[PDB]
C-alpha cells in the first residue's frame, strides 16, 4: 500500500469543488469536511464508550471519552479558521451555493441522538437518502449514552424510576427527580462512588464542549452573515440561538443548585 | 437542488476510511491523517495566493491569507493531542497490517516544504509511480518559493540584493545570503520606514515557528507511540534543524 | 543592574499573594485562576490603551500589531477555563462558606476593560467607592471616549459623514446603534480595497467582541457547572445575571452591517 | 445594579480575598519601552501557574504514596490543563519583535531563569535532580531550603516505582531506595514492570493509566521546553559562542526513561 492508497486520499483530496470563482470557497468547503471527518471518529468513539457503559466496563470508556474530549477541542478551536472569512468574501460565493444546510448532516444528527437530543422531526432532511435515513432512524430508536448511564446507575443500586430505565427512546430527555437524587448521592459521597463521580464529570465536559461548539458556530455564522432577523424560528441565526438552550444531561446540571 | 452532502462530497470523503486491522484505534490513525491532509490542501491554496500577492506587490491581502494560514497551523499543531491518546499496545495491534507506507509519500506536505523554500529534488522519488503528484511536486520544485519572492520584492523596492539570489537554480535548498540579511536588518532597524516589510518578516518567522512546533509534535508523538540516522525517529529528529528563512533568524543576533 | 530574577519580577509579592481561607485543596486553583486572569487583564489594558492612542493619532499599523497581541492574550484567557472546569461542585461547596461576598463583580480592571470597549455603566463605579484609587481609575475610564468611539471619530476624519452627535457626546453613556455609523462601515466593507485599513480595523473590533463573547460564555458555563442556579456570592442572581450580560453588544453597527451587505 | 453588593467599606472584597494589591502592583518596568509589560507579565503568569502546579503535583505524589490513585489521576488531569496554558502562553510572547526587545535589553541585567526556584522544584519533583542547580538560590536561604528539600525528597516517579514494588513487581531494591539527590536513570527491572503493565493493560489498568499520565506530563514539558527555545531564539537569536545552546541541550532531558524505552521493546 501507498500512503495515499491506505488513507483513501484519491477520494479525500478530490472532493473540493468550488461553485463560485472566489478564493474563499475552499475554506468554506474544507472547514465543513474536516469537521465531518472528526465527527465520523467521534461517532466511532462514542458508540464504543456507550458499549462500555452498557457492559459495566467504565475504565476503557473513560479513555474513549477523553479521546472524544480532545476531538471536541479541535472542533471548537476550528472556528478560529472560519472566523477569518469576512462578509464580502462570503457574499461573493453566496449566489452559487443553493439551499444546502448543516441541517442535513446526518452524522451531526446521530451525535445529538447519541447524546440524548432526540427529535423525530429531524429525520425529514434525510428522507431522500434511504441510507442516511436508516442511520439516523436507528440512532433515534437506540438508547442514548446518557440513557445507558442512568441504566448503569440503577444497576449499581440507585433507586431510579423504571420509566426512565425503560421508555420510548425516540423521545427527548426530560428531567427526572429520581435521577437527580442518584447523582446527588454520588457527588455528596464521591469516594464511595468514584467511577460514577468521574462519569458524571465526563458527561458535564462533553456537554460543556458541545455548548462551546454551539456558541462558536452561531457567533461565527453571525459574523459572516449576520442575524437575519424576521426570517423564521426554524432556520438562520434565530434557530442557532435557540440551540443554545438545549440541555443534554439535565439532572447533572440541576444537581449543582441542590447540592 | 444541491444537497449539503452533494456540495461537500460526503459520499466520497465519508467512505474513504478503510481500516486493515480489527483494532478499534485504527479509525483514529486514519482520520488524523485525513483531516491533516485536508487542512494542508487549504493551506496550499492560501499560500499560493499569498505568494501571488507578494509577487504582484499587493501585500495587504497576502497578510490576511498568511494570518489564515497561521490559524490552520494552530489547528494542525493541536491535532497532535488527539493522536497522543493512542497508546503503544493500541498501535501495536494495528501495525502488522500497515505495510511500509510512509508520510514521505505525502505530496501535499512536500509542496508545502517547497513553497517554503525547503527544496530537495530527491524528494520527487516517492511520487514517481503517480504522474499527477509527480507533476505537482516537480513544478513546485522549479517554482520560486514564497521566500524567493519576498527577496525579489525587496530588490524591486530598492534594496541591494545579490543578482545570484534574485535569479537562481530554484530546485536548490534555500541558503544564507549576506545581502538579504542586510536588507532585512535595515527593515528591522527602521520598522516605521518599512512597515510592510517588517510585518512580512514577522509572518515568515511565525510560519517557520509554527512549522517547527508541528515538526516537534510530530516527532514527539511518533516517539511516544513506537519509541526511538537513515529514516525513523532519527530522521524526524534531524528535521528539527531544517531552517527555512535563515537570514530572518540570523538577523536577531546582529540586530 | 545586579538585581535578580525574583527581584525584577516582584516574585516576593506575586508568590505570597495566595491566601486560601478554607481547608480545601482546591482553593489554590480558585485563587490562582483569578490572579493569572487579572495579571493578563493588566497587560490587556496596557495594550488596549496604547492601541486606542494609535487609533486617535492615526497610527493604525502599530495599533493593529497591539490588537493582534490583545487577541493572543484573549486566546489564553478563554482556554484558561479548561483549568477551572476541573473543579467539581463538592470541591467548590467546601470552600464557599469561607468566601463571604467577594466576587468578580468587584474587579475594577474588568470594568476598565468593558469601558474601553464602550460598555459604559455609571452604576459600576459603586463597588469601588471604598478604594478611592480604583474609584478614580474607573471614573476616569467612564469619562474617556472608548476605543470604538475613537474608531468612529477616525472614520469621520477619513471623510465619512458621521452624525456630529456621535463624533462628540456624553461618553459615560453606553454604546447605541447609529445609522450613519453603519453606513460608514458598509461603504468600507463594500469597497475593501479602497478602504483596507478601515476594513482590517473593523475585523479587529469584531474579533475582539467575538473573543470577549467566548470568554463571557465560558465564564457563565463554568459557573453553572460549579454552582448551578444558586445565587452568586456577589449577591447577584448569579448565572441569570451573567447570561444577561452575554446579551450586550459592544460594536452594534459592525454586526448589523452583515445583514445589509 | 441587579441585587449586587455595592458597599465594601466593611466587607472583604474580591481584591482583599485575592491579594490583588500584591499582584497588581508588582509590575515595575525599568526601560521606558511599551513592551516591557509583556516581558514581565508573561513571567509572572507562568510563575503563578507554576505555584498551582507544585501544589497539585505534591498532592498527586501523596496519593501515589498512599496508594490512593483515583484522586491523584484527577490532580494530574488538572496539571495537564495547567501545562496546556503554559505551552500556549508562548503565543503571546511571540508577538515581541527583536527591536522591541533590544530596546529594553540595556535595562535588564543578569536575571537568569535559572533563578526560578519554583521551576527547579518542578524539575526536581519530576526526577530531574541536579545539586548544582541549588547554586542560583544561595543568596536566598528560604528559596534554597525549598529547593534542597525537593532535591532530597523522592520524585513523583520514584514514588511510582516504589508503588509498583508494593504491588508485587520485582523491582531492584537499589531503585526502591536510592540516593534521591542522584539524577533519574534507566533501570531494567523498572522497564520489565512497565512492560508487564502495558502488555496486560486490563490486569493493571491503574498503572497503565498512570504510565500514560507520566508520558503526557513529560511530552507537555518537552513542548514547553521547545516553545521556550524557539521563542527565545526568535527574540535574541542563537549565539554560537548558559545561552540558547543550553536551552537546546534541555530538549534532551528525559524524565521517565523506561516508559519511553518500553515502546521499542513492546
Ligand atoms: C460561514 C459558514 C457557515 C454558515 C453561513 C452557516 C450557517 C448555518 C445556519 C443558518 C444554520 C441553521 C440551519 C439553517 O438555517 O439551514 C446552520 C446549522 C448547522 N450547521 Fe452551520 N454555518 C456555517 C459553517 C458551518 C460549518 C463549518 C459546519 C461544520 C460541519 C457547520 C455545521 C452545521 C450543523 C451540523 C448544523 C445543524 C445544527 C443544529 O441543527 O443544531 N456549519 N448553519
Ligand atoms: C503514530 C503515528 C505516526 C507514526 C508512527 C509516524 C512515523 C513517521 C516516521 C518514522 C517518519 C520519518 C520518515 C520515515 O521513516 O517513514 C514520518 C514522516 C512523515 N510523517 Fe509521520 N507518523 C505518524 C503520524 C503522522 C500523521 C498523523 C501525519 C499527518 C499527515 C504524518 C505525516 C508525516 C509526514 C508529512 C512525513 C514526512 C516528513 C518529512 O519529510 O520531514 N505522520 N512519519
Ligand atoms: C468556578 C469559580 C467561579 C465562580 C463560581 C464564579 C461566579 C461568578 C458569579 C455568580 C458572578 C455574578 C456576580 C455575583 O453574583 O457575584 C461572577 C461575576 C464575575 N466574575 Fe466569576 N466565577 C468564577 C470564576 C471567575 C474567574 C476565574 C474570573 C476571572 C477574573 C471571574 C471573573 C468575574 C467577573 C469579571 C465578574 C463580573 C462580570 C459582570 O459583572 O459582567 N470569575 N462570577
Ligand atoms: C524573550 C524572553 C526570554 C528570553 C530572552 C529568555 C532567555 C533564557 C535563556 C537564554 C535561558 C538559559 C539560561 C541563561 O543563560 O540565563 C533561560 C532559562 C530559563 N527561562 Fe527563559 N527567556 C525568556 C522568557 C522566559 C519566560 C517568559 C519564562 C517563564 C517563566 C522563562 C523561564 C525560564 C526558566 C524556568 C529557565 C531555566 C531553564 C532550565 O534550567 O532548563 N523564560 N531563559
Quickly tell me which residue has 530596546 as its cell: D103
SS3 B50: helix
Angle between the D205-236 and A58-77 helix axes, to the nearest 10 degrees? Answer: 20
Residue D232 marked as a ligand binder: no
Q: Which of B12, B20, B84 sits opposite A15 (nearest CB)?
A: B12
How many Cβ contacts (< 8 angstroms) between chains B and C?
Answer: 6
D103: closest CA of chain C, how far (Å)? 16
Sequence-distant contacts of B197-202: CB under 8 A, at least 24 apart: B197/B154, B197/B157, B198/D97, B199/B59, B199/B63, B199/C61, B199/C65, B200/B54, B200/B59, B200/B62, B200/B63, B200/B150, B201/B248, B202/D97
Contacts of C65 in chain B (CB under 8 A): 199
The radius of gyration of chain D's CA atoms, rounded to the nearest angstrom, is: 21
Sequence length of chain C is 261
| Positions of E strands within chain B | none
Quickly tell me which residue has 466587607 as its cell: D11
B133: closest CA of chain D, how far (Å)? 33
- Separation of CA C75 and ligand 2 centre (Å): 29
CA dist., res. A17 & res. A62, Å (int): 39
- CA quadruple B80, B82, B83, B87: dihedral sign: positive
| Apex B111 CA angle, B108 and B112, nearest 5 | 90
H or E element in which residue A91 lies = helix A87-93
Q: Which of A40, A71, A73 sits opposite B14 (nearest CB)?
A: A40
> In terms of residue numbers, what domain contains D63?
1-266
Residue B205 marked as a ligand binder: no
Q: Which of A59, A194, A198 sits opposite D205 (nearest CB)?
A: A59
Quick one: three-class SS letters along chain D? Answer: CCCCCCCCCCCCCHHHHCCHHHHCCCCCCCCCCCCHHHHHHHHHHHHHHHHHHHHHHHHHHHHHHCCCHHHHHHHHHHHHHHHHHHHHCHHHHCCCCHHHHHHHHHHCCCCCHHHCHHHHHHHHHCCCCCHHHHHHHCCCHHHHHHHHHHHHCCCHHHHHHHHHHHCCCCCCHHHHCCCCCCCCCCCHHHHHHHHHHHHCCCCCHHHHHHHHHHHHHHHHHHHHHHHHHHHHHHHHCCCCCCCHHHHHHHCCCCCCHHHHHHHHHC
CA dist., res. C52 & res. C148, Å (int): 9
C-alpha dist (Å) from residue C151 to B6, B84, C28, C67, C140: 43, 45, 41, 13, 19
Grid cell digits, residue A9: 486520499
CA dist., res. B194 & res. C238, Å (int): 51
The 8-class DSSP code of residue C175 comes to: P
CA dist., res. D247 & res. D240, Å (int): 12
Annotated binding site of C for substrate: 30-34, 92, 96, 233
SS3 B251: coil
CA dist., res. B67 & res. C76, Å (int): 18
- CA quadruple C50, C51, C52, C54: dihedral sign: positive
Quick one: three-class SS letters along A106-129? Answer: HHHHHHHHHCCCCCHHHHHHHCCC
CA dist., res. B82 & res. C181, Å (int): 45
Ligand nearest to the CA of B41: 2
Ligand nearest to the CA of B77: 2
Contacts of D225 in chain B (CB under 8 A): none
CA dist., res. A62 & res. D205, Å (int): 12
CA dist., res. A35 & res. A157, Å (int): 40
Grid cell digits, residue A258: 441542590
Which residue lies with its CA nearest to atom 18 of ligand 1? A102
C62: closest CA of chain B, how far (Å)? 9
Give the phi and the psi of residue B189 in degrees, each rounded to 5. Answer: -80, -15
| Positions of E strands within A93-213 | none
Contact predicate B191/B235, CB 8 Å: no
Q: Which of A164, A74, C16, D206 is closest to B77 using CA atoms? A: A74
Contact predicate A97/A84, CB 8 Å: no
User: How far is CA D34 from its chain centroid?
Assistant: 30
Contact predicate B208/B80, CB 8 Å: no
Annotated binding site of C: 30-34, 92, 96, 219, 233
Domain count, chain B: 1
The 8-class DSSP code of residue C117 comes to: T
Grid cell digits, residue C180: 450613519
B121 touches chain A (CB under 8 A): no
The C-alpha torsion from C195 through C197 and C198 to C201, rounded to 10°, is 150
B120 touches chain D (CB under 8 A): no
CATH number at residue A235: 1.20.58.480
CA dist., res. D176 & res. D182, Å (int): 13
CB-count burial class (<10 Å; 0-12, 13-18, 19+) for C200: buried
Q: Which of D144, D85, D147, D116 is closest to C11 using CA atoms? A: D116
**Residues framing ligand 1 (Cβ under 6 A):** A 31-32, 35-36, 82, 85, 90, 101-103, 105, 108, 217, 221, 224-225, 235-236, 239-240, 243
Q: Which of B103, B97, B91, B79 is closest to B24 using CA atoms? A: B91
End-to-end CA distance of chain B: 60
- Separation of CA A241 and ligand 1 centre (Å): 12
Contact predicate D115/D137, CB 8 Å: yes
CA dist., res. C20 & res. B99, Å (int): 57
DSSP readout, B168-236?
--TTS-----HHHHHHHHHHHHSGGGSHHHHHHHHHHHHHHHHHHHHHHHHHHHHHHHH----SHHHHH
CB-count burial class (<10 Å; 0-12, 13-18, 19+) for D138: exposed
What residues contact residue A192 under an 8 Å CB cut-off, 6+ apart? none
A100/B6 Cβ within 8 A:
yes
B182: closest CA of chain D, how far (Å)? 15
Amino acid at each position: 500500500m501507498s500512503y495515499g492508497d491506505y488513507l483513501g486520499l484519491d477520494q479525500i483530496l478530490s472532493a473540493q469543488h468550488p461553485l463560485s470563482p472566489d478564493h474563499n470557497e475552499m475554506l468554506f468547503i474544507v472547514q465543513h469536511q474536516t469537521t465531518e471527518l472528526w465527527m465520523k471518529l467521534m461517532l466511532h468513539e462514542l458508540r464504543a464508550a456507550r458499549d462500555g457503559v452498557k457492559s459495566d466496563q467504565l475504565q476503557p470508556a473513560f479513555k474513549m471519552l477523553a479521546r472524544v474530549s480532545r476531538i471536541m477541542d479541535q472542533l471548537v478551536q476550528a472556528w478560529n479558521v472560519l472566523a477569518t472569512m469576512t462578509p464580502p468574501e462570503y457574499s461573493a460565493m453566496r449566489p452559487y451555493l443553493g439551499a444546502s444546510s448543516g441541517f442535513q448532516s446526518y452524522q451531526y444528527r446521530e451525535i445529538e441522538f447519541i447524546l440524548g437530543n432526540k427529535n423525530a422531526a429531524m429525520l425529514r432532511p434525510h428522507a431522500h437518502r434511504p441510507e442516511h435515513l436508516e442511520l439516523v432512524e436507528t440512532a433515534l430508536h437506540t438508547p442514548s449514552m446518557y440513557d445507558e448511564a442512568i441504566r448503569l446507575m440503577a444497576r449499581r443500586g440507585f433507586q431510579i424510576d423504571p420509566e426512565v430505565v425503560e421508555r420510548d427512546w425516540t423521545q427527548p430527555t426530560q428531567y427526572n427527580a429520581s435521577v437527580e437524587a442518584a447523582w446527588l448521592e454520588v457527588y455528596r459521597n464521591p469516594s464511595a462512588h468514584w467511577e460514577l463521580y468521574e462519569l458524571g464529570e465526563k458527561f458535564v465536559d462533553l456537554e460543556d464542549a458541545f455548548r462551546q461548539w454551539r456558541f462558536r458556530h452561531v457567533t461565527t455564522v453571525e459574523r459572516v452573515i449576520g442575524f437575519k432577523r424576521g426570517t423564521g424560528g426554524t432556520e438562520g441565526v434565530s434557530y442557532l440561538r435557540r440551540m443554545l438552550d438545549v440541555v443534554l444531561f439535565p439532572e447533572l446540571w440541576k444537581l449543582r443548585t441542590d447540592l
